[PDB]
Amino acid sequence: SMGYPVIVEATRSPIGKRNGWLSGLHATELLGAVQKAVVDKAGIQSGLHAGDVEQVIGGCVTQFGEQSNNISRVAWLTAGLPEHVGATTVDCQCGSGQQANHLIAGLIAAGAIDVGIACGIEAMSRVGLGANAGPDRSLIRAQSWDIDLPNQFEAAERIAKRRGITREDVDVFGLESQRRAQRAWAEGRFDREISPIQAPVLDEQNQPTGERRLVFRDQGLRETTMAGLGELKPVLEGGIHTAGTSSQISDGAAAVLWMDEAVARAHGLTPRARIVAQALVGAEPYYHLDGPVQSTAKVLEKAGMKIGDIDIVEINEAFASVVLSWARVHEPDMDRVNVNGGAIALGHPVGCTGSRLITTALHELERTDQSLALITMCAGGALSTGTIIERI
Amino acid sequence: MGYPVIVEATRSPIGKRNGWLSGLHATELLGAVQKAVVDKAGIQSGLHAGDVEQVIGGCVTQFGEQSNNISRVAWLTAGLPEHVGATTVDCQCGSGQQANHLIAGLIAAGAIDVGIACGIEAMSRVGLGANAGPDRSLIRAQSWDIDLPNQFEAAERIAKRRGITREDVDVFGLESQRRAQRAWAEGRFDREISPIQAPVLDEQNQPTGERRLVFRDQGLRETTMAGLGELKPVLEGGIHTAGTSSQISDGAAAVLWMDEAVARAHGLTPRARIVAQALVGAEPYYHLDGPVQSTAKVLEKAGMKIGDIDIVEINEAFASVVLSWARVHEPDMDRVNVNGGAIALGHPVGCTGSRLITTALHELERTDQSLALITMCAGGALSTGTIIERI
Ligand SMILES: CC(=O)SCCNC(=O)CCNC(=O)[C@H](O)C(C)(C)COP(=O)(O)OP(=O)(O)OC[C@H]1O[C@@H](n2cnc3c(N)ncnc32)[C@H](O)[C@@H]1OP(=O)(O)O
Ligand SMILES: CC(C)(COP(=O)(O)OP(=O)(O)OC[C@H]1O[C@@H](n2cnc3c(N)ncnc32)[C@H](O)[C@@H]1OP(=O)(O)O)[C@@H](O)C(=O)NCCC(=O)NCCS
């Protein structure tokens, strides 16, 4: 239409563990640092400045306290960035950070803006899941509510049972998530996409020691063995998922700089990717988190593509069974799926992850000189986001 | 790909705090207006709620009943199809208006052919500030050093900037009630309002079992210049009072958008399109003077001047905000908030942006005029602006 949106830059913090390396930052400082970082990554040779950005849209799930009151705006102001830039924070639960990209591209397509930033934040050390309601969570839905929507841990089990996924099957998968994340770090695959973040050091009681680190490494990786995974106790009684086959609670932020193509060309910025097809669809409430099956089918239809066409898949690892369910339906080549590991090993700062995945997918297309990626996430409320991006 | 147009729009009546709508769960109030806007298009055409691809709803205080993506929860709660995706957005005061911008963007991009933009705020049930704990200092970094006042101090700073007196705002506040009463007396709001079934409560805020169909805005009341003159200012030394500031309210609104050619193929008539949209940052020192910038931005983008615009809806958070904007842009004030505004009709924050688009469109249609401008100030020092054009 009146714009042609392309990604020119994308960057993410390292992902910290709960009460870990980034836990001493205010949620607004963490997001602000990455917003600033993605602008800075355009370089002096771009002539682009933060005040050339027209709008920022960031995903965030638990919009309480530090994360309330439009954190995307608060962060941007806290990082010292120019006040005339508009900002909006979005919640479609887990997919927020991905839908933030979809929305920015849409405003560029519409000719409403020429330059945008899509981002996501979750400082789960600071603002934990469920802070955005009081203790009796029955109160948050109307008395008339009668949809079998399970909690996410029961959802993963129901999905495993529906697909015949076993304890062994998920352990094998969790192991390979850690292995591939450790490969990626060993080989320096994440070195382009990461913006190291200054954070204060907190001790085991969460108290400042005085020192600050520039944090540049994902915290969630660790020595993992099948035997080790075999010993872990399941989160639910009779469940198959354990800590080692579920995403980690994490702190992180990620941001993607978008422009209309002719504005990228003016700044001499290579257009790196565009969206082929995007969606956000509802899933079956009973299974809750099997939605990647539907968002994948919806983007493949819109793109006129099949799963064979896609070079790289990033499908969030909220639980092993979610990915394995998806794969038994859509039948990918698993060597193409989460090639640098996923949330089991890397962490899942919920509102960040959808921008983080777009960042990770793009850079791996670039590293391997390939063309197409598919990004897909399950999300609370029984939803799912899907993107296919193509390198330009 | 797409050419976004408004095909239907509707709003609930606006209840006062602990008033006519206060017994609805926030998810039921939004869900009712989602359903209503579908039914308005479904009756005349082949369209069904499952033809909607995505819903985007604004909401400001995303806590408790309003947490966990209320747009989605409301859609399921109303019994609408589960395959429709939904997202809730917060740019504070402008959330409802930005939800419309974003739905239009997704259509332009060809991501969706049909969507709903909406907004909700159930302020009786989830009050401002519920999305943070008691110590508000905690919600900003210790490094924060921007002079961003609270909204009440902001209204005064703006009054001072513009030479706006206690008298001037009271004159405005009066006209806002008079205009809203004229609109109600003439039935101007009859087309836009979906009446909403709401539980009746007893003295102690407990349901009786009675339900009533609510169709009237609750905030209207008999107002005089003498009466406004005896009201106490909210701040010491301030000019604004309860009679010159928006009323805390409950309400929802929803707007159905389609790609124009798809709308026609469905047998629906496109009613308006967006000429220019923006969401801009404002001066933090004044906080709420942003409608001056958002108005300038959409005009520049549209290649228009203020005198091109037939009807303006600018949100009356505080009288000074509107008077300040009018002193900068010099509209004909007979075209501004012609059916009243939030002083009289109330300001369910996350709803209002969709509610003003609804009100504006319907007043373009009622007068057979072409262009409207909708502009809001917003917490965090932001402002949303839209110019729409009747088709
Ligand atoms: C940026 C934005 O978009 S704004 C965002 C959201 N807005 C806000 O910040 C909050 C909006 N306003 C408020 O917080 C509150 O409504 C206030 C502080 C302005 C006033 O609230 P209240 O005082 O509870 O409303 P209320 O109607 O009771 O007014 C107070 C008194 O003035 C009187 N009053 C108000 N309007 C009138 C009138 N037109 N005629 C006669 N009396 C009136 C009332 O009788 C009431 O009596 P009391 O004070 O003796 O009890
Ligand atoms: C799954 C979950 C409950 C686990 O929480 P947790 O118990 O705090 O996890 P911890 O980090 O404390 O690890 C628990 C134990 O498992 C063991 N463990 C976990 N991963 C391991 C690995 N890769 N190798 C070896 N041992 C491992 C550890 O030994 C640890 O105990 P230890 O440190 O004393 O040895 C938590 O991560 C969570 O709730 N995740 C969210 C679920 C989700 O996916 N959400 C969906 C969003 S779409």
Q: Are B27 and B70 in contact (CB under 8 A)?
A: yes
CATH 3.40.50.300 holds for A1-392: no
Distance CA B371, CA B356 (A): 14
Distance CA A355, CA A36 (A): 15
Residue B119 annotated as lining a ligand binding site: no
Three-state secondary structure readout of B23-65: CCCHHHHHHHHHHHHHHHHHCCCCCCHHHCCEEEEECCCCCHH
**Residue having the nearest C-alpha atom to atom 41 of ligand 1:** B227
Please give the angle made by the CA atoms of A34, A36 and A39, to the nearest 5 degrees.
110
Q: How far is CA B239 from CA B21, B158, B208, B226, B230, in A?
A: 30, 11, 41, 15, 12
Beta pairing partners, B237 = none
**Residue having the nearest C-alpha atom to atom 17 of ligand 1:** B242
Distance CA A372, CA A313 (A): 9
Distance CA A359, CA A255 (A): 8
- Residue B284 with chain A: CB contacts under 8 Å: 77, 83
Q: How far is CA B17 from CA A253, B82, B126, B247, B376, in A?
A: 38, 32, 11, 8, 21
**Which residues 6+ apart lie within 8 Å of B287 measured at CB?**
B148, B149, B151, B154, B157, B158, B377, B379, B381
Distance from the CA of B326 to the center of ligand 1, in angstroms?
A: 23
How was it solved? Answer: X-ray
Which ligand has the minimum distance to the alpha carbon of residue A231? 2
Helix (H, G, I), strand (E, B) or coil at B144: coil
Q: Single out the residue of B191, B235, B103 nearest to residue A90, CA to CA.
A: B103
Q: Single out the residue of B224, B218, B238, B219 nearest to residue B173, CA to CA.
A: B224
Residue B23 structure tokens: 């017994």
Q: How far is CA B183 from CA A36, A108, B359, in A?
A: 48, 38, 11
Q: Single out the residue of A275, A244, A257, A272 nearest to residue A366, CA to CA.
A: A272
Question: In chain A, after which residues does the backbone break, taking C–N over 2.5 angstroms as a break?
Answer: none
Element (H, E) at B255: strand B249-259
Residue B243 structure tokens: 């009679």
Q: Are B286 and B154 in contact (CB under 8 A)?
A: yes
Query: How many CA atoms are closer than 13 Å to the CA of B159, on its beta-carbon side?
Result: 22
Residue A119 structure tokens: 């981002």
Distance CA B158, CA A370 (A): 55
Beta pairing partners, B389 = B273, B371
Give backbone dihedrals phi and psi of A53, rounded to 5 degrees, phi first. -75, 130
Please give the angle made by the CA atoms of A370, A4 and A305, to the nearest 5 degrees.
45
From A381's Cα to the closest Cα of chain B, the distance in A is 7
Q: Are A355 and A101 in contact (CB under 8 A)?
A: yes
Give backbone dihedrals phi and psi of A259, rounded to 5 degrees, phi first. -145, 160
Query: How many CA atoms are closer than 13 Å to the CA of B296, on its beta-carbon side?
Result: 13
H-type alpha helices, chain B = 26-42, 70-77, 95-108, 151-162, 166-186, 225-229, 260-265, 291-302, 319-329, 342-345, 349-367
Among this protein's residues, is A348 annotated catalytic? yes
Please give the angle made by the CA atoms of B138, B141 and B143, to the nearest 5 degrees.
135
Distance CA B346, CA B341 (A): 7
Distance CA B149, CA B16 (A): 26
From A86's Cα to the closest Cα of chain B, the distance in A is 4
Q: Are A263 and A7 in contact (CB under 8 A)?
A: no
Residue B210 structure tokens: 């009675």
Largest CA distance in chain A: 59
- Look at the block and give the residue holding tokens 């001499």: A268
Cβ pair A111:B111 closer than 8 A: no
Q: Is the dihedral of CA A126, B58, B345, B148 positive or negative?
A: positive
**Which residues 6+ apart lie within 8 Å of B214 measured at CB?**
B12, B13, B15, B20, B21, B195, B196, B197, B198
Residue B221 annotated as lining a ligand binding site: yes
Beta strands at A312-315 and A372-379: parallel, antiparallel or unpaired: parallel
How big is the A-B interface in CB pairs under 8 Å?
Answer: 230
Residue B337 structure tokens: 């908030």
3-state helix, strand, coil in chain B (%, to 5): 40, 25, 40
Q: Work out the number of other CB atoms within 10 angstroms of the CB of residue B110.
A: 17
Distance CA A241, CA A156 (A): 8
Distance CA B243, CA B223 (A): 9
- Per-residue b/e over B270-283, b at no fewer than 16 CB within 10 Å? bbbbbbbbbbbbbb
Distance CA B301, CA B282 (A): 18
Regarding the domain with residue range B1-391, which homologous superfamily does it belong to in the CATH classification?
A: Thiolase/Chalcone synthase (3.40.47.10)
Please give the angle made by the CA atoms of A138, A143 and A148, to the nearest 5 degrees.
70
Q: Single out the residue of A129, A144, A139, A101 nearest to residue A10, CA to CA.
A: A101
Q: Which residue of A has its CA nearest to B100?
A: A107
Within 6 Å (CB) of ligand 1, which residues are found? B 93, 151, 221, 223, 227-228, 231, 234, 242-243, 245-248, 288, 315, 317, 347, 349, 377-379
| Interface contact A296, partner B, CB < 8 A | no
End-to-end CA distance of chain B: 19
Q: Are A60 and A106 in contact (CB under 8 A)?
A: no
Q: How many residues does chain A have?
A: 392
Q: Single out the residue of A72, A66, A115 nearest to residue B95, CA to CA.
A: A72
What does the DSSP 8-state code read for residue B335? Answer: G
Q: Are B310 and B335 in contact (CB under 8 A)?
A: yes
Distance CA B259, CA B270 (A): 9
Distance CA B145, CA B285 (A): 12
Q: Using CA atoms in the order B264, B267, B271, B277, what is the torsion angle rounded to 10 degrees?
A: -50
B330: left (phi over 0), alpha (psi -120 to 50) or beta: left
Beta pairing partners, B15 = B250
Cβ pair B108:A111 closer than 8 A: yes
Give backbone dihedrals phi and psi of A378, rounded to 5 degrees, phi first. -90, 160
Could you tell me the residue ranges of all domains in chain B? 1-391
Q: Are A310 and A376 in contact (CB under 8 A)?
A: no
Q: Single out the residue of A379, A121, A377, A355 nearest to residue A258, CA to CA.
A: A355
Quick one: how far is CA B4 from the chain centroid? 20
Three-state secondary structure readout of chain A: CCCCEEEEEEEECCCEECCCCCCCCCHHHHHHHHHHHHHHCCCHHHCCCHHHCCEEEEECCCCCHHHCCCHHHHHHHHCCCCCCCEEEEEEECECHHHHHHHHHHHHHHCCCCCEEEEEEEEECCCCCCCCCCCCCHHHHCCCCCCCCCCCHHHHHHHHHHHHCCCHHHHHHHHHHHHHHHHHHHHHCCCCCCECCEEEEEECCCCCEEEEEEEECCCCCCCCCCHHHHHHCCCCCCCCCCCHHHECCCEEEEEEEEEEEHHHHHHCCCCCCEEEEEEEEEECCCCCCCCCHHHHHHHHHHHHCCCHHHCCEEEECCCEHHHHHHHHHHHCCCHHHECCCCCHHHHCCCHHHHHHHHHHHHHHHHHHHCCCEEEEEEEECCCEEEEEEEEEC
Q: Are B251 and B363 in contact (CB under 8 A)?
A: no
Distance CA B71, CA B254 (A): 11
Distance CA A27, CA B144 (A): 13
